[PDB]
Design a protein around this ligand. Structure first.
Ligand SMILES: [Ca+2]
Length: 188
């Protein structure tokens, strides 16, 4: 049951579990996935199961990739769940950058923002989308607003430094880049 203190370090005060509790979870985990590794397909299924009202395939895929297809270990699988469903968005900005930097080349492009914003948009039920502000109710509008808030040109590249600054300072950027299905819904 090693990676548990590793899980808590990389999670810190963000963890919603203790080492003894993570081990129990870990124990159940191994019963279901003996190898302790979970594939992208299996990960996607978790979200498809628990987000019946939406279409979480792309979202789950992007989340899985943020940890580098292939497989995730228990530590990543636990952290991945925390990133999407627990804690404060503010303690996840470094990870959020990893999420938005789709190809992982170190910077975020305009298209990459559209990719993630679209994936996140599909996590919203059709029902709740009518509550979205007019200038923020379609993937294109939201991604473009985000790009505008960072004052970028179509071919500009957004750095981690700037990403973190703006998501911290400009609360409208935070609202727009928001990736937690429940938080997006609640703010609406
Ligand atoms: Ca990139």
């Amino acid at each position: 049951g090693a990676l548990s203190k590793e899980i808590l370090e990389e999670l810190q005060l963000n963890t919603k579990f203790t080492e003894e509790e993570l081990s129990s979870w870990y124990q159940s985990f191994l019963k279901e996935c003996p190898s302790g590794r979970i594939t992208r397909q299996e990960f996607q299924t978790i979200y498809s199961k628990f987000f019946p009202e939406a279409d979480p395939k792309a979202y789950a895929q992007h989340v899985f990739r943020s940890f580098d297809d292939g497989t995730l270990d228990f530590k990543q699988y636990v952290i991945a769940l925390h990133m999407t469903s627990a804690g404060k968005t503010n303690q996840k900005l470094e990870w959020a950058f990893s999420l938005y930097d789709v190809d992982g080349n170190g910077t975020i492009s305009k298209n990459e923002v559209l990719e993630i914003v679209t994936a996140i948009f599909k996590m919203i039920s059709p029902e709740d989308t009518k509550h979205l502000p007019e200038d923020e109710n379609t993937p294109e509008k939201r991604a473009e607003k985000i790009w505008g808030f960072f004052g970028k040109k179509d071919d500009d590249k957004l750095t981690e430094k700037e990403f973190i600054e703006g998501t911290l300072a400009n609360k409208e950027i935070l609202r727009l880049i928001q990736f937690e299905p429940q938080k997006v819904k609640e703010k609406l």
